[PDB]
PDB file of C-alpha atoms and ligand atoms in Angstrom:
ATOM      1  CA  UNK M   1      -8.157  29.873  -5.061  1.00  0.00           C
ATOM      2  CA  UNK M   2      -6.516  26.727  -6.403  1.00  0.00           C
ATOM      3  CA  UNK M   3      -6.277  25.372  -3.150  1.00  0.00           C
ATOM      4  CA  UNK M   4      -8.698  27.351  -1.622  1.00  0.00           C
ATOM      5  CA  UNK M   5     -11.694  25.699   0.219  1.00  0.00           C
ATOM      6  CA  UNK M   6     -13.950  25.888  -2.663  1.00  0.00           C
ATOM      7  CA  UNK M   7     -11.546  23.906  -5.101  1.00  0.00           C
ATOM      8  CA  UNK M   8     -11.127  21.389  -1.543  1.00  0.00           C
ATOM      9  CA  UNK M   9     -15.140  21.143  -1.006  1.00  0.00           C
ATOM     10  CA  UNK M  10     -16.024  20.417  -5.204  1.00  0.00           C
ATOM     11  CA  UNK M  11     -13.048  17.700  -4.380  1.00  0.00           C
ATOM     12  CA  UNK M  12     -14.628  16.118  -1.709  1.00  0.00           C
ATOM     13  CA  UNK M  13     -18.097  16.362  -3.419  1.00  0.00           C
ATOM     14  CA  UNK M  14     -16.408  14.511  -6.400  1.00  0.00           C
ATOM     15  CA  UNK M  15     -14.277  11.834  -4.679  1.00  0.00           C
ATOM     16  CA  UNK M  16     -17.438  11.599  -1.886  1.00  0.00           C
ATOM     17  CA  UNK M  17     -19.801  10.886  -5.574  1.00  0.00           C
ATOM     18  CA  UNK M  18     -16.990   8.212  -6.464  1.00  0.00           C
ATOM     19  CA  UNK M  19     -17.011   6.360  -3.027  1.00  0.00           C
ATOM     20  CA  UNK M  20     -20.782   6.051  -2.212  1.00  0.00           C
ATOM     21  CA  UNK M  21     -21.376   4.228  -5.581  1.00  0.00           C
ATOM     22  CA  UNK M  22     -18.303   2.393  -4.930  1.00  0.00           C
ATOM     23  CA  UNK M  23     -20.094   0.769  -2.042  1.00  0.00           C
ATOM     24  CA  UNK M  24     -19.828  -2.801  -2.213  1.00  0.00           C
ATOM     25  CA  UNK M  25     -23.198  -4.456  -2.794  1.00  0.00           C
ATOM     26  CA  UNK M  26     -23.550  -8.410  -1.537  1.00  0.00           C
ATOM     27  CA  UNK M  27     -22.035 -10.543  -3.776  1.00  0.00           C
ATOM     28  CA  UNK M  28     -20.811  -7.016  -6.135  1.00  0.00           C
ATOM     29  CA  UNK M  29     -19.626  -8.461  -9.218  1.00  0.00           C
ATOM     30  CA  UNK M  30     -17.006  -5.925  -8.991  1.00  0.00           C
ATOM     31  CA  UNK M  31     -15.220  -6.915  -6.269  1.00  0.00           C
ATOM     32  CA  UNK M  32     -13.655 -10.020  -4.961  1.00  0.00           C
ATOM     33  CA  UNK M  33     -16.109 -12.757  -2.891  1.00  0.00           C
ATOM     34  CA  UNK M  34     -15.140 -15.030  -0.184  1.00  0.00           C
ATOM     35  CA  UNK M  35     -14.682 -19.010  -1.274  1.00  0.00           C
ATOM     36  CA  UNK M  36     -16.904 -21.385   0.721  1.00  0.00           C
ATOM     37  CA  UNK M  37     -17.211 -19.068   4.049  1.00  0.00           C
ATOM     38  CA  UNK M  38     -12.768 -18.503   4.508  1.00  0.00           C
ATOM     39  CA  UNK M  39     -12.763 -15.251   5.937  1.00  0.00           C
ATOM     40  CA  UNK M  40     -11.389 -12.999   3.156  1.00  0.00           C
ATOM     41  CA  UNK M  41     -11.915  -9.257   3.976  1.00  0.00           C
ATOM     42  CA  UNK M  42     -10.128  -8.107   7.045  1.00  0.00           C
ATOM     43  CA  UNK M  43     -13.144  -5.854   7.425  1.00  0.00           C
ATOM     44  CA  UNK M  44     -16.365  -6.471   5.710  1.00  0.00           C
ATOM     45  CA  UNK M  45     -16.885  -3.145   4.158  1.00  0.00           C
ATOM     46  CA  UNK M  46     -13.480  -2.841   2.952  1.00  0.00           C
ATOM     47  CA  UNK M  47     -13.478  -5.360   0.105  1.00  0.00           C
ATOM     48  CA  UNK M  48     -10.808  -6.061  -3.549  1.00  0.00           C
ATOM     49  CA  UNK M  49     -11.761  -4.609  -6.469  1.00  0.00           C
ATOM     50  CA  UNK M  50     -11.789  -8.424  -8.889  1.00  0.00           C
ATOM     51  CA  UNK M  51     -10.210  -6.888 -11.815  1.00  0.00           C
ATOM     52  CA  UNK M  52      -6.927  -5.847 -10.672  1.00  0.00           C
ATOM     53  CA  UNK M  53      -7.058  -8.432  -7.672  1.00  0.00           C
ATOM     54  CA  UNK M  54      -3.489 -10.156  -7.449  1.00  0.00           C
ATOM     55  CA  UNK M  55      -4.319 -13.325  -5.917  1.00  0.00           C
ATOM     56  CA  UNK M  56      -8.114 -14.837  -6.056  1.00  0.00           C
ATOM     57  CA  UNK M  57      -7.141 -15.608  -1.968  1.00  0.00           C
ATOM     58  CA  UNK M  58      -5.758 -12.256  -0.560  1.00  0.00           C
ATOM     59  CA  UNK M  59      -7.211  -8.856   0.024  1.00  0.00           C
ATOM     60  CA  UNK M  60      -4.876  -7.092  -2.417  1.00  0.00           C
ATOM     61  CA  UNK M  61      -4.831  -4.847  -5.519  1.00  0.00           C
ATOM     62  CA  UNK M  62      -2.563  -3.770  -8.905  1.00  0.00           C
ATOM     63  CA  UNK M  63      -2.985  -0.277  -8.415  1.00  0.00           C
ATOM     64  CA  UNK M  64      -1.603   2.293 -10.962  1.00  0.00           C
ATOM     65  CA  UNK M  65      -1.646   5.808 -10.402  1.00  0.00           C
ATOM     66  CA  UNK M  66      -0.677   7.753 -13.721  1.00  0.00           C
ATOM     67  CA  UNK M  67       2.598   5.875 -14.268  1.00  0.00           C
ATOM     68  CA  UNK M  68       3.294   4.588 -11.015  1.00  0.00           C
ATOM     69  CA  UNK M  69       2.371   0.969 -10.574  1.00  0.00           C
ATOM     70  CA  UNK M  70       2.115  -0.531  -6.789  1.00  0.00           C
ATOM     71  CA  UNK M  71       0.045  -3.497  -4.910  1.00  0.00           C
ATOM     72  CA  UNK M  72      -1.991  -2.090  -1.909  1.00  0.00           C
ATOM     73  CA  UNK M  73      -3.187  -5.084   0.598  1.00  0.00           C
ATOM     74  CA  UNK M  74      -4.894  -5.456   3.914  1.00  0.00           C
ATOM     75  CA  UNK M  75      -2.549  -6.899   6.555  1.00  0.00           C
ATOM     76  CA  UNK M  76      -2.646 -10.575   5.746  1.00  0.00           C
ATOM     77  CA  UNK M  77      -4.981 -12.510   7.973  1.00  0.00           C
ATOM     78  CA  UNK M  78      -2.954 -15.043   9.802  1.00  0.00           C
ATOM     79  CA  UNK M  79      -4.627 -17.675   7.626  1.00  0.00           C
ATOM     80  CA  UNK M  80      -3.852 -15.938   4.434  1.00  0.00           C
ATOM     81  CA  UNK M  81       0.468 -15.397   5.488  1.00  0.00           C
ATOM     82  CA  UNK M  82       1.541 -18.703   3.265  1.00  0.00           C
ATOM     83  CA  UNK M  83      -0.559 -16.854  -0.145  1.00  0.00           C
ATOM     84  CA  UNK M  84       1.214 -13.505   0.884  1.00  0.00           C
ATOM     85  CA  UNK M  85       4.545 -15.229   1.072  1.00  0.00           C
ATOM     86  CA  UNK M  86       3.851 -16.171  -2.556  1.00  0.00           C
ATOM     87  CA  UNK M  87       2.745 -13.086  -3.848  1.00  0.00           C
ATOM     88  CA  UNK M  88       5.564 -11.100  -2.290  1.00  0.00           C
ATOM     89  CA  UNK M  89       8.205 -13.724  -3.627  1.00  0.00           C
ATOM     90  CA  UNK M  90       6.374 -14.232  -6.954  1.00  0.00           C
ATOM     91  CA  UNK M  91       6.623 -10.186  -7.581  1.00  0.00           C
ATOM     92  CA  UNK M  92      10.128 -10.076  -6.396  1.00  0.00           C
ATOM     93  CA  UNK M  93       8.976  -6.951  -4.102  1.00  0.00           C
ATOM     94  CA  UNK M  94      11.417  -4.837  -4.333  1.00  0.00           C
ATOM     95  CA  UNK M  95       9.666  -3.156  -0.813  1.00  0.00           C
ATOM     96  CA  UNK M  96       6.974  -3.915   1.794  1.00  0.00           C
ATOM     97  CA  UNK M  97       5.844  -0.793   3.367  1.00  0.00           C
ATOM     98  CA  UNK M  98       4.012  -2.018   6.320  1.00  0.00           C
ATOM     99  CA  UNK M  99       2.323   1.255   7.893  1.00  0.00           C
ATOM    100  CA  UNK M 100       0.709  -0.523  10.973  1.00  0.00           C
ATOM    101  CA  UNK M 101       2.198   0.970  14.058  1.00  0.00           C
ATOM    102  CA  UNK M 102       3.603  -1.620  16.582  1.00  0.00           C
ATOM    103  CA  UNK M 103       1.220  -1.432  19.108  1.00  0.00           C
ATOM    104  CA  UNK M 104      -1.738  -2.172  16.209  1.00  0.00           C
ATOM    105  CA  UNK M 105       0.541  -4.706  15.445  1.00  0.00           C
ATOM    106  CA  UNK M 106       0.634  -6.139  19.597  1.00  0.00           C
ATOM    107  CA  UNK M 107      -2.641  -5.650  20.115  1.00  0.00           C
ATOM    108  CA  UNK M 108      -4.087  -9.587  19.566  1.00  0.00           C
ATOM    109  CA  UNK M 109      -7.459  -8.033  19.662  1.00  0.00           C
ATOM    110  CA  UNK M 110      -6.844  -6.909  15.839  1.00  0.00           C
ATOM    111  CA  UNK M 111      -5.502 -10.503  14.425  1.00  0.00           C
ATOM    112  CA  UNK M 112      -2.129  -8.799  12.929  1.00  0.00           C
ATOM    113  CA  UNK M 113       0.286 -11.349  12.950  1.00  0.00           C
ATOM    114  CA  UNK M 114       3.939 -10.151  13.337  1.00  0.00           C
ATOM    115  CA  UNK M 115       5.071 -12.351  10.314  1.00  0.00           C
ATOM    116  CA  UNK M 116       7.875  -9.637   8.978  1.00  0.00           C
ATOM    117  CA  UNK M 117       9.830  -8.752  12.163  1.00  0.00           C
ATOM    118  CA  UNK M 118       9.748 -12.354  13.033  1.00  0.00           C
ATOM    119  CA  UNK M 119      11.242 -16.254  11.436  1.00  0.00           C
ATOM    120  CA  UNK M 120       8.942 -18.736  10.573  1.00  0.00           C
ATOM    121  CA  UNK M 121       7.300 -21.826   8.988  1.00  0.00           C
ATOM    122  CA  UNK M 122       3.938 -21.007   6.849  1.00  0.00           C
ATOM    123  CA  UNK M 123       2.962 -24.168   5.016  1.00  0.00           C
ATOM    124  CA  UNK M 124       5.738 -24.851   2.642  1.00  0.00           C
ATOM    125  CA  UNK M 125       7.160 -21.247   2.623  1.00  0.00           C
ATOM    126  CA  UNK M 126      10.135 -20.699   5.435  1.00  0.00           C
ATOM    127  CA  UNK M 127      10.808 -17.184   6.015  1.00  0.00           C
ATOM    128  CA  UNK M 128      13.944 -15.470   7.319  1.00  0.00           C
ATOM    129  CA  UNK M 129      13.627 -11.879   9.192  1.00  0.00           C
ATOM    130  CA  UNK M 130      16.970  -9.707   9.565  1.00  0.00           C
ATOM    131  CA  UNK M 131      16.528  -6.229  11.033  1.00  0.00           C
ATOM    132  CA  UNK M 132      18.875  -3.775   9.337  1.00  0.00           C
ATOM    133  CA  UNK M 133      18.844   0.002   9.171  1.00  0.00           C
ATOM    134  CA  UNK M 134      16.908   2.418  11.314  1.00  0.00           C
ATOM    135  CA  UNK M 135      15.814   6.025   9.358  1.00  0.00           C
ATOM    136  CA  UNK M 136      14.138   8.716  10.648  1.00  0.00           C
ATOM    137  CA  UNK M 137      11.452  10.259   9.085  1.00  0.00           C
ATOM    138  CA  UNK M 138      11.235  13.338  11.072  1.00  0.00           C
ATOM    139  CA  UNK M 139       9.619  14.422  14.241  1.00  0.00           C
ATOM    140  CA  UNK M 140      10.456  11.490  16.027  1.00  0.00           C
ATOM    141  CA  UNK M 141       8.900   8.889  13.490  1.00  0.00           C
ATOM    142  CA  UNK M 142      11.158   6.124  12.722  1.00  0.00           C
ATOM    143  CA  UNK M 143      11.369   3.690  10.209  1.00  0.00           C
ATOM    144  CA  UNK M 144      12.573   0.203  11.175  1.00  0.00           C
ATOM    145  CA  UNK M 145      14.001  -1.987   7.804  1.00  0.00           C
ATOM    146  CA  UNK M 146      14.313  -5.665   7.519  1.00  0.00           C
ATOM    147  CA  UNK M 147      15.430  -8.089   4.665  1.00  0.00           C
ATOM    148  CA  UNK M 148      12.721 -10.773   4.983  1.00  0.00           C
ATOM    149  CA  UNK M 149      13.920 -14.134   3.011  1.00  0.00           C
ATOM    150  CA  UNK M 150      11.345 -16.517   1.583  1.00  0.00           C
ATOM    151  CA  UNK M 151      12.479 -19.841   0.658  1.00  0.00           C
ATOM    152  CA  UNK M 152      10.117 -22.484  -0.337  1.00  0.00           C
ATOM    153  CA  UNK M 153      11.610 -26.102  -1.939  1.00  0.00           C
ATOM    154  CA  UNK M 154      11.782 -25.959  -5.559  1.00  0.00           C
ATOM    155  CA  UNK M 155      10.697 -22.227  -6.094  1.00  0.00           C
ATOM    156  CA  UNK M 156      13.483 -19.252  -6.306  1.00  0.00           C
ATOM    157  CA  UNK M 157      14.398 -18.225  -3.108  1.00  0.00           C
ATOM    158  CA  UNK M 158      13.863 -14.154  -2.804  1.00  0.00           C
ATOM    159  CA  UNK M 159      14.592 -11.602  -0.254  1.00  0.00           C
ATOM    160  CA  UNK M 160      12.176  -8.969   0.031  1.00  0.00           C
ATOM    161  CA  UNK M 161      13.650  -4.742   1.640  1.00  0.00           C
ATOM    162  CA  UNK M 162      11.196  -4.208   4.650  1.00  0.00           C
ATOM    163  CA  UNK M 163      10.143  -0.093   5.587  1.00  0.00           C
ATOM    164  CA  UNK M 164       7.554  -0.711   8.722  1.00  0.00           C
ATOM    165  CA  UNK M 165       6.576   2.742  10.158  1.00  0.00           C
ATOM    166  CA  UNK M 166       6.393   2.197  13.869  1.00  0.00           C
ATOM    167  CA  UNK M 167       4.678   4.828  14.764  1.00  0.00           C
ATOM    168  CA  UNK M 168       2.369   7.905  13.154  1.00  0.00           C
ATOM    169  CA  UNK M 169       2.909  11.183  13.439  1.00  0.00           C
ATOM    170  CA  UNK M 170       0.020  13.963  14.390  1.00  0.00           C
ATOM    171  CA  UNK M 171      -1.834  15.730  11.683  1.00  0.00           C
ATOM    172  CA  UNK M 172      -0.676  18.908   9.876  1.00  0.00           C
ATOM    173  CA  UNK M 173       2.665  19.807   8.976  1.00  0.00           C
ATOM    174  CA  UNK M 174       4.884  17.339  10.664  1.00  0.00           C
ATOM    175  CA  UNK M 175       2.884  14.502   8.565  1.00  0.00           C
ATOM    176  CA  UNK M 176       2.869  16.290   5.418  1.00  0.00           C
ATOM    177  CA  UNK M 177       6.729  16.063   5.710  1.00  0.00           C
ATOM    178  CA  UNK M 178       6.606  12.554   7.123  1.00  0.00           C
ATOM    179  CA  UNK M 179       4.999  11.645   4.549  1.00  0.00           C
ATOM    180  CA  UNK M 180       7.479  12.664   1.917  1.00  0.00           C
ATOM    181  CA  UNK M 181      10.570  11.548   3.871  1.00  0.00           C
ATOM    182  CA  UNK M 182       8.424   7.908   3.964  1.00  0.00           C
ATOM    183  CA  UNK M 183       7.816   8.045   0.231  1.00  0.00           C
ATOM    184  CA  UNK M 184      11.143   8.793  -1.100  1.00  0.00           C
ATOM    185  CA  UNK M 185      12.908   6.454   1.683  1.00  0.00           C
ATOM    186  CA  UNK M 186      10.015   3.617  -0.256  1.00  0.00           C
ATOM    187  CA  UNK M 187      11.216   4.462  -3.703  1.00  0.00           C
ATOM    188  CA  UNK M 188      14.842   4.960  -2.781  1.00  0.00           C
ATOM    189  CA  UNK M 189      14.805   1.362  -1.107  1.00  0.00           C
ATOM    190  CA  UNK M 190      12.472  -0.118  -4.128  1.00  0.00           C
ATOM    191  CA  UNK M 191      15.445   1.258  -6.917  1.00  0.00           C
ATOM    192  CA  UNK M 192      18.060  -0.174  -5.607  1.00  0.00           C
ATOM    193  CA  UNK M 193      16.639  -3.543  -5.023  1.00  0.00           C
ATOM    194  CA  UNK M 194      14.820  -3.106  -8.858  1.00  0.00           C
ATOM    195  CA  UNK M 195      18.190  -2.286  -9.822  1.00  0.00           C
ATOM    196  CA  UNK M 196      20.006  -5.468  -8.654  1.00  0.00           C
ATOM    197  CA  UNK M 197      17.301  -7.802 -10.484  1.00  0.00           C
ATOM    198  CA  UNK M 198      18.026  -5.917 -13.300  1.00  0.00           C
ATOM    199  CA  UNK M 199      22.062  -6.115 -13.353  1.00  0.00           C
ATOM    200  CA  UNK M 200      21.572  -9.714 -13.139  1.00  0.00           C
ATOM    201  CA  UNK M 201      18.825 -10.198 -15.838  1.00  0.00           C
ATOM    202  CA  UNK M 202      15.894 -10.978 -14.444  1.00  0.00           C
ATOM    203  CA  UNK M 203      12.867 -11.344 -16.636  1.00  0.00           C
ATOM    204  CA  UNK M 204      10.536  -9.851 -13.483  1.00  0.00           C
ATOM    205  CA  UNK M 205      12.237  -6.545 -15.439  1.00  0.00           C
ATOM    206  CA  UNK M 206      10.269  -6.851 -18.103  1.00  0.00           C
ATOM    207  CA  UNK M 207       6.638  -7.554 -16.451  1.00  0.00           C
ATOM    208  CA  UNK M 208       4.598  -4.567 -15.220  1.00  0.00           C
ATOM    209  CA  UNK M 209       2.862  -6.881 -13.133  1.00  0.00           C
ATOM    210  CA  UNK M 210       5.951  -7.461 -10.882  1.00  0.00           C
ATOM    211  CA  UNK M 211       8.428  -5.479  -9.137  1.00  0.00           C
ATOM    212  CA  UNK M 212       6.222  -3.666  -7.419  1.00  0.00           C
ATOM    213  CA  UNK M 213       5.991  -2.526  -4.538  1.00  0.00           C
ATOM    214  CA  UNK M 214       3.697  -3.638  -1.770  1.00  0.00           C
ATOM    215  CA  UNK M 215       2.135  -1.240   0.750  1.00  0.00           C
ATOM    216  CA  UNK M 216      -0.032  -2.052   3.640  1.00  0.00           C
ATOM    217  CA  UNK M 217      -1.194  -0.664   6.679  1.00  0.00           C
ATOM    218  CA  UNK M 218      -4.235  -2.232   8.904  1.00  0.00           C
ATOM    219  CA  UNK M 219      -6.908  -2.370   6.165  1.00  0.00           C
ATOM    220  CA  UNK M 220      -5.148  -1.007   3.363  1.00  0.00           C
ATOM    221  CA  UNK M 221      -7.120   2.066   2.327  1.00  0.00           C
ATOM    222  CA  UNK M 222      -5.760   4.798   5.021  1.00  0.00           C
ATOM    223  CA  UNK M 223      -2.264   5.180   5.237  1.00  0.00           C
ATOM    224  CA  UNK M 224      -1.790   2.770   2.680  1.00  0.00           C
ATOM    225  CA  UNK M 225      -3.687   5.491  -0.193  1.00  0.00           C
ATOM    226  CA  UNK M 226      -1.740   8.878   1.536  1.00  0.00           C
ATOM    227  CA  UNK M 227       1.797   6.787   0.573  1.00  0.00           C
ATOM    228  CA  UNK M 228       0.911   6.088  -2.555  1.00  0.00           C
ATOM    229  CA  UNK M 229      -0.591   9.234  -3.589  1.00  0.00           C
ATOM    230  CA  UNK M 230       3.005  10.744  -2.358  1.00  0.00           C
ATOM    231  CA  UNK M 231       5.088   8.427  -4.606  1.00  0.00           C
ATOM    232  CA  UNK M 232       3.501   9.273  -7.842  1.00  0.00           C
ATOM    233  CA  UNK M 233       4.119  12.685  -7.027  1.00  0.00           C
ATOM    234  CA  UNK M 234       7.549  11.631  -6.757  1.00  0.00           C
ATOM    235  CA  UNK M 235       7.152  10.094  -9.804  1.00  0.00           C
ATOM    236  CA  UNK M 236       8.848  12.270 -12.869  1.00  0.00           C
ATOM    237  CA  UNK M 237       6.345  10.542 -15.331  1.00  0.00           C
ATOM    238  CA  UNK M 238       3.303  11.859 -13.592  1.00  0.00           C
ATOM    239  CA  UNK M 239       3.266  15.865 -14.827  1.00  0.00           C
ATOM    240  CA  UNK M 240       0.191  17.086 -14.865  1.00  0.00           C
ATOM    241  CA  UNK M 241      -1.839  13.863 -12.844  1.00  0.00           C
ATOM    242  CA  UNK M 242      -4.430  15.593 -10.638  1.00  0.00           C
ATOM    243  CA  UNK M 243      -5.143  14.634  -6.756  1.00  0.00           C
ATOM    244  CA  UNK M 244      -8.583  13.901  -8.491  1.00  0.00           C
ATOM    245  CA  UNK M 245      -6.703  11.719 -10.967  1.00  0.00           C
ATOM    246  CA  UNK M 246      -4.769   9.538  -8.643  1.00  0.00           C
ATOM    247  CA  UNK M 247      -7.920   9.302  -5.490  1.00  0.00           C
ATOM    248  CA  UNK M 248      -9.887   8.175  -8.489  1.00  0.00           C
ATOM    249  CA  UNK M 249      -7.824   6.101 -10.046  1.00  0.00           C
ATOM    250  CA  UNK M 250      -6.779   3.960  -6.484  1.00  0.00           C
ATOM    251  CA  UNK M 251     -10.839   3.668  -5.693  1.00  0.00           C
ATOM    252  CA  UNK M 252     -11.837   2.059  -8.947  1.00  0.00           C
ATOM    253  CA  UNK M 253      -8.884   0.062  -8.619  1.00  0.00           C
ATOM    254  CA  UNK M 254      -9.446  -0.936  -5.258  1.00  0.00           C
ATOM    255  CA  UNK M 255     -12.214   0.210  -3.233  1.00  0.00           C
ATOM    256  CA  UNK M 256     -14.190   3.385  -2.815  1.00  0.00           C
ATOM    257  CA  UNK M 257     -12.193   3.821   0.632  1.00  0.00           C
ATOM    258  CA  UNK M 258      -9.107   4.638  -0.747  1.00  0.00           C
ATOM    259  CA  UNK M 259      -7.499   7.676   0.871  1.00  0.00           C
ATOM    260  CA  UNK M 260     -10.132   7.183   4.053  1.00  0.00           C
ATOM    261  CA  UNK M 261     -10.282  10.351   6.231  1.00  0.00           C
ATOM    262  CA  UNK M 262     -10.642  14.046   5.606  1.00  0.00           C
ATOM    263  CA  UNK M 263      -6.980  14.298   7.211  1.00  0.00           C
ATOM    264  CA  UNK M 264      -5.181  11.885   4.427  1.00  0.00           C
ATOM    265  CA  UNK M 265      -7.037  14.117   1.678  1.00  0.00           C
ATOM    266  CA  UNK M 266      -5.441  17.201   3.406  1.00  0.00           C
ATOM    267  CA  UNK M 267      -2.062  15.594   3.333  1.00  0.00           C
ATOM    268  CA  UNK M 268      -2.396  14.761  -0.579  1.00  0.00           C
ATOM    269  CA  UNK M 269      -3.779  18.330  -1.135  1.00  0.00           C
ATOM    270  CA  UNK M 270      -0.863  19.832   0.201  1.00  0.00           C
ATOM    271  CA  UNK M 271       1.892  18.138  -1.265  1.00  0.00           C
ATOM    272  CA  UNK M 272      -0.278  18.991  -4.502  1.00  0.00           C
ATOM    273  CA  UNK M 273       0.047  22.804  -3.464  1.00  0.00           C
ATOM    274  CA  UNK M 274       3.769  21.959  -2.922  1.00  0.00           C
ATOM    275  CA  UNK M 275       4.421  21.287  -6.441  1.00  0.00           C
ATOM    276  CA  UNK M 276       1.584  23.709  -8.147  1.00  0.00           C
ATOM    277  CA  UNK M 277      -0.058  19.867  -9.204  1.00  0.00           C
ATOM    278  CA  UNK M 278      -3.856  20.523  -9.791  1.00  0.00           C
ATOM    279  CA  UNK M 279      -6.503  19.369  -7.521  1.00  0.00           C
ATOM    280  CA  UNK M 280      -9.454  18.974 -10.140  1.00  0.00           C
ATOM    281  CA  UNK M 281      -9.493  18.307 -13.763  1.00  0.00           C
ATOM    282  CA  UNK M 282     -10.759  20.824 -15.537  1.00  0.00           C
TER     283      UNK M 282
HETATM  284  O1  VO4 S 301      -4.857   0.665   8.925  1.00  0.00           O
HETATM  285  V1  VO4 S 301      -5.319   2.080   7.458  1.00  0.00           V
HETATM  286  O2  VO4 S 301      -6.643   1.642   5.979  1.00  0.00           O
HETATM  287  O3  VO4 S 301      -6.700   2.832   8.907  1.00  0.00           O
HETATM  288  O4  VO4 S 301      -4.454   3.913   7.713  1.00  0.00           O
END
C-alpha cells in the first residue's frame, strides 16, 4: 500500500506536474543564460537553476536536500575545466563523484574531457592526478579514487578525494545496493577529508556554501539525482524527508530533470521502502 503502485503512480503524477512546468522557457528568468553565444549547457534542455547557481560560468547547482547540502554539475565542457578547477578548489571538495562510465568518458563524440584521471595545465590552474584506492561496490562495479591537486600561483593549493564509478550496474536489485555501497563510500570519503580541514582550522568549516561535495555524471540530472537522493537517506538529520521531499527539492534547485528515468525513481523508492521513509507527503 505504501509502496504499492498507487502511492508510485500519484508520485510520478506529482514529480511529472513539477517537471513539465519546470521546463525551461528561452531566456527563463529562472535559470542560468549563456554570455555572448559561449556554449554553457552541455545539453540545451538541461539548463542551472540561477538562484542556487555556483558559478555565473558553469552548469552547476547548491543543492540541499532536507539537511544534506551538495553541488550537482554537468561534466565540465572542455572550455569550462579552468572555472571548475576554481570551484572545486574554492569549496575545498571534500569529494568529486564523477558517475560517467569510462567509455562515456572515451567516447570523443560526447566532448568529456578526462581532466581527473589525468595532469594538466588549464589557464593558470595546474592540476596533479594520483590514482589511489580501488573499492568495490558490488556486482562487479568498481570504484576507482584519485587525489586530484590544484595549484594555481598565489591561491591555496587544495587536493580534492576522487570516487569515479567506471562502470553501471543493471537495473533492479544489484543497483539498489550499488547504490548504497556508492553513497556511503561518498560520505565516508567526504568525512574524513571534512574532518582534516577541520583539525587544522579552516574557516571553509564554518560556510554552508563550501565543503561540499560535488557530484556529476554526463549531464548531471541522472545518476547524479539517484546518489544524492541515497546520501540524505544516509543522512541522520533527514527523519521523516519524503522521496517527494528530496525529487522536489533537487528540481527547483536545479532543473525539472532531476532524478531522469522511471528506473532512478525506482531505485529512490526502494531504498525509501528500506527504511519505512514515506513516499508522499501527506
Ligand atoms: O549522464 V546522467 O544526467 O544520464 O545519469
Amino acid at each position: 500500500s505504501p509502496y504499492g503502485p498507487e502511492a508510485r503512480a500519484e508520485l510520478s503524477s506529482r514529480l511529472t506536474t513539477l517537471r513539465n512546468t519546470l521546463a525551461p522557457a528561452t531566456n527563463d528568468p529562472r535559470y542560468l543564460q549563456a554570455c555572448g553565444g559561449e556554449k554553457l549547457n552541455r545539453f540545451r534542455d538541461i539548463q542551472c537553476r540561477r538562484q542556487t547557481a555556483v558559478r555565473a560560468d558553469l552548469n552547476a547547482n547548491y543543492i540541499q536536500v532536507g539537511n544534506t547540502r551538495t553541488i550537482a554539475c554537468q561534466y565540465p565542457l572542455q572550455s569550462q575545466l579552468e572555472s571548475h578547477f576554481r570551484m572545486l578548489a574554492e569549496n575545498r571538495t571534500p569529494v568529486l563523484a564523477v558517475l560517467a562510465s569510462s567509455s562515456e568518458i572515451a567516447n570523443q563524440r560526447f566532448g568529456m574531457p578526462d581532466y581527473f584521471r589525468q595532469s594538466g595545465t588549464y589557464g593558470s590552474i595546474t592540476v596533479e592526478s594520483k590514482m589511489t584506492q580501488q573499492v568495490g561496490l558490488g556486482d562487479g562495479i568498481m570504484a576507482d579514487m584519485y587525489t586530484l591537486t590544484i595549484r594555481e600561483a598565489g591561491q591555496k593549493t587544495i587536493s580534492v578525494p576522487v570516487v569515479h564509478v567506471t562502470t553501471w550496474p543493471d537495473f533492479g536489485v544489484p543497483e539498489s545496493e550499488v547504490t548504497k555501497a556508492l553513497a556511503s563510500l561518498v560520505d565516508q570519503t567526504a568525512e574524513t577529508k571534512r574532518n582534516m580541514y577541520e583539525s587544522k582550522g579552516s574557516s571553509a568549516v564554518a560556510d554552508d556554501s563550501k565543503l561540499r561535495p560535488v557530484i556529476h555524471c554526463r549531464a548531471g540530472v541522472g545518476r547524479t539525482a539517484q546518489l544524492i537522493g541515497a546520501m540524505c537517506m544516509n543522512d541522520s538529520r533527514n527523519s521523516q524527508l519524503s522521496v517527494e521531499d528530496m525529487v522536489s527539492q533537487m528540481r527547483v534547485q536545479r532543473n525539472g530533470i532531476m532524478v531522469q528515468k522511471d528506473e532512478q525513481l525506482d531505485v529512490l523508492i526502494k531504498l525509501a521502502e528500506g527504511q519505512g521513509r514515506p513516499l508522499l507527503n501527506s
